[PDB]
Amino acid sequence: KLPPGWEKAMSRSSGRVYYFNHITNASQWERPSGEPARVRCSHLLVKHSQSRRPSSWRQEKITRTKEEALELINGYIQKIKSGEEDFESLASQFSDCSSAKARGDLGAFSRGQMQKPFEDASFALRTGEMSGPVFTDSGIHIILRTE
Ligand SMILES: Cc1occc1C(=O)O
Numbered sequence: 001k002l003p004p005g006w007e008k009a010m011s012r013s014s015g016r017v018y019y020f021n022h023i024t025n026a027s028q029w030e031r032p033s034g035e036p037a038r039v040r041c042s043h044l045l046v047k048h049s050q051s052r053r054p055s056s057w058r059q060e061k062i063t064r065t066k067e068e069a070l071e072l073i074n075g076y077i078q079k080i081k082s083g084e085e086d087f088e089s090l091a092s093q094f095s096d097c098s099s100a101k102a103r104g105d106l107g108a109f110s111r112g113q114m115q116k117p118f119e120d121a122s123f124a125l126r127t128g129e130m131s132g133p134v135f136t137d138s139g140i141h142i143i144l145r146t147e
Protein backbone atom coordinates (compact mmCIF):
# COMPACT_ATOMS: atom_id res chain seq x y z
CA LYS A 1 0.00 0.00 0.00
CA LEU A 2 2.28 2.75 1.37
CA PRO A 3 6.07 3.21 1.63
CA PRO A 4 8.00 1.44 4.43
CA GLY A 5 6.71 2.40 7.87
CA TRP A 6 3.68 4.48 6.79
CA GLU A 7 0.14 3.92 8.08
CA LYS A 8 -3.13 5.84 7.94
CA ALA A 9 -4.45 7.67 10.99
CA MET A 10 -7.23 10.05 12.00
CA SER A 11 -6.81 13.54 13.40
CA ARG A 12 -8.52 13.81 16.77
CA SER A 13 -9.10 17.52 16.41
CA SER A 14 -10.09 17.69 12.73
CA GLY A 15 -11.36 14.24 11.69
CA ARG A 16 -9.23 14.33 8.52
CA VAL A 17 -7.05 11.33 7.72
CA TYR A 18 -3.31 11.73 7.87
CA TYR A 19 -0.25 9.54 7.46
CA PHE A 20 2.14 8.54 10.23
CA ASN A 21 5.44 6.70 9.86
CA HIS A 22 6.25 4.52 12.83
CA ILE A 23 9.96 4.23 11.93
CA THR A 24 10.61 7.95 11.49
CA ASN A 25 7.77 9.39 13.63
CA ALA A 26 7.01 11.68 10.69
CA SER A 27 3.42 12.71 10.27
CA GLN A 28 1.78 14.61 7.44
CA TRP A 29 -1.59 15.25 5.82
CA GLU A 30 -0.52 14.20 2.32
CA ARG A 31 -0.28 10.63 1.05
CA PRO A 32 3.41 9.67 1.25
CA SER A 33 5.44 9.55 -1.96
CA GLY A 34 6.14 5.98 -3.08
CA GLU A 35 17.09 0.92 -0.48
CA PRO A 36 20.49 2.53 -1.11
CA ALA A 37 23.84 1.42 0.24
CA ARG A 38 24.31 4.78 1.94
CA VAL A 39 22.30 7.79 2.94
CA ARG A 40 23.47 11.20 4.02
CA CYS A 41 21.72 12.86 6.95
CA SER A 42 21.87 15.90 9.16
CA HIS A 43 20.38 15.94 12.62
CA LEU A 44 19.49 18.12 15.57
CA LEU A 45 20.06 16.34 18.87
CA VAL A 46 18.51 17.38 22.17
CA LYS A 47 20.14 15.55 25.03
CA HIS A 48 18.57 15.01 28.44
CA SER A 49 19.42 13.75 31.89
CA GLN A 50 19.19 10.07 30.83
CA SER A 51 21.35 10.54 27.73
CA ARG A 52 24.32 8.18 27.53
CA ARG A 53 26.57 11.23 28.00
CA PRO A 54 24.61 14.13 29.55
CA SER A 55 27.07 16.77 28.34
CA SER A 56 27.56 18.73 25.13
CA TRP A 57 29.31 21.77 23.72
CA ARG A 58 26.25 23.79 24.83
CA GLN A 59 26.16 22.58 28.44
CA GLU A 60 28.74 20.86 30.61
CA LYS A 61 25.95 19.21 32.65
CA ILE A 62 22.73 18.52 30.78
CA THR A 63 19.98 18.35 33.38
CA ARG A 64 16.76 18.72 31.38
CA THR A 65 14.31 15.84 31.54
CA LYS A 66 13.44 13.59 28.61
CA GLU A 67 10.00 15.19 28.60
CA GLU A 68 11.53 18.67 28.44
CA ALA A 69 13.86 17.50 25.64
CA LEU A 70 10.90 16.19 23.66
CA GLU A 71 9.13 19.52 24.17
CA LEU A 72 12.13 21.33 22.70
CA ILE A 73 12.26 18.87 19.79
CA ASN A 74 8.55 19.34 19.15
CA GLY A 75 8.95 23.11 19.15
CA TYR A 76 11.85 22.94 16.70
CA ILE A 77 9.83 20.71 14.39
CA GLN A 78 6.97 23.21 14.52
CA LYS A 79 9.19 26.15 13.56
CA ILE A 80 10.84 24.16 10.74
CA LYS A 81 7.46 23.10 9.37
CA SER A 82 6.03 26.61 9.55
CA GLY A 83 9.10 28.11 7.84
CA GLU A 84 9.74 30.34 10.84
CA GLU A 85 13.16 28.69 11.21
CA ASP A 86 15.44 26.56 9.06
CA PHE A 87 16.59 23.12 10.14
CA GLU A 88 20.23 24.06 9.53
CA SER A 89 19.91 27.20 11.65
CA LEU A 90 18.27 25.42 14.57
CA ALA A 91 20.83 22.61 14.35
CA SER A 92 23.78 25.03 14.43
CA GLN A 93 22.34 26.88 17.41
CA PHE A 94 20.75 24.16 19.51
CA SER A 95 21.97 20.67 18.60
CA ASP A 96 23.78 18.99 21.51
CA CYS A 97 25.93 17.12 18.95
CA SER A 98 29.38 18.16 17.81
CA SER A 99 27.88 18.06 14.31
CA ALA A 100 26.11 21.35 15.13
CA LYS A 101 29.28 23.09 13.83
CA ALA A 102 28.46 21.57 10.38
CA ARG A 103 24.79 22.58 10.48
CA GLY A 104 24.01 19.09 11.75
CA ASP A 105 25.57 17.23 8.82
CA LEU A 106 26.85 13.73 9.67
CA GLY A 107 27.91 12.90 6.12
CA ALA A 108 27.11 9.59 4.52
CA PHE A 109 26.76 6.27 6.29
CA SER A 110 25.76 2.64 5.79
CA ARG A 111 23.61 0.32 7.82
CA GLY A 112 25.49 -0.91 10.90
CA GLN A 113 27.32 2.34 11.77
CA MET A 114 24.72 4.45 13.61
CA GLN A 115 22.52 3.69 16.60
CA LYS A 116 19.70 1.46 15.36
CA PRO A 117 16.72 3.83 15.80
CA PHE A 118 18.65 6.54 14.01
CA GLU A 119 19.77 4.21 11.23
CA ASP A 120 16.25 2.88 10.73
CA ALA A 121 14.69 6.32 10.51
CA SER A 122 17.43 7.62 8.23
CA PHE A 123 16.90 4.79 5.73
CA ALA A 124 13.11 5.07 5.85
CA LEU A 125 13.29 8.77 5.07
CA ARG A 126 13.12 9.67 1.40
CA THR A 127 15.71 12.11 0.10
CA GLY A 128 14.70 15.54 1.34
CA GLU A 129 12.39 14.21 4.08
CA MET A 130 12.53 15.02 7.79
CA SER A 131 11.78 12.74 10.72
CA GLY A 132 9.72 13.36 13.79
CA PRO A 133 11.32 12.81 17.20
CA VAL A 134 13.67 9.82 17.04
CA PHE A 135 14.86 8.39 20.35
CA THR A 136 18.31 6.93 20.88
CA ASP A 137 20.56 6.52 23.84
CA SER A 138 22.14 9.88 22.90
CA GLY A 139 18.92 11.84 23.23
CA ILE A 140 16.08 12.85 20.91
CA HIS A 141 16.85 13.58 17.26
CA ILE A 142 15.34 15.42 14.36
CA ILE A 143 16.77 13.77 11.23
CA LEU A 144 16.94 15.37 7.79
CA ARG A 145 17.91 13.06 4.94
CA THR A 146 19.89 15.06 2.39
CA GLU A 147 21.11 12.34 -0.03
C1 LIG B 1 9.05 12.04 27.10
C2 LIG B 1 8.62 10.85 26.32
O1 LIG B 1 9.59 9.89 26.12
C3 LIG B 1 9.01 8.88 25.38
C4 LIG B 1 7.74 9.19 25.11
C5 LIG B 1 7.47 10.46 25.72
C6 LIG B 1 6.21 11.18 25.66
O2 LIG B 1 5.98 12.09 26.44
O3 LIG B 1 5.39 10.86 24.80
Ligand SMILES: Cc1occc1C(=O)O
Pocket residue numbers: 078079
Ligand atom coordinates in the same frame (compact mmCIF):
# COMPACT_ATOMS: atom_id res chain seq x y z
C1 LIG C 1 2.47 26.86 19.98
C2 LIG C 1 2.53 25.89 18.86
O1 LIG C 1 3.39 26.19 17.84
C3 LIG C 1 3.30 25.18 16.92
C4 LIG C 1 2.42 24.26 17.33
C5 LIG C 1 1.90 24.71 18.58
C6 LIG C 1 0.92 24.02 19.38
O2 LIG C 1 0.37 24.58 20.30
O3 LIG C 1 0.66 22.86 19.11
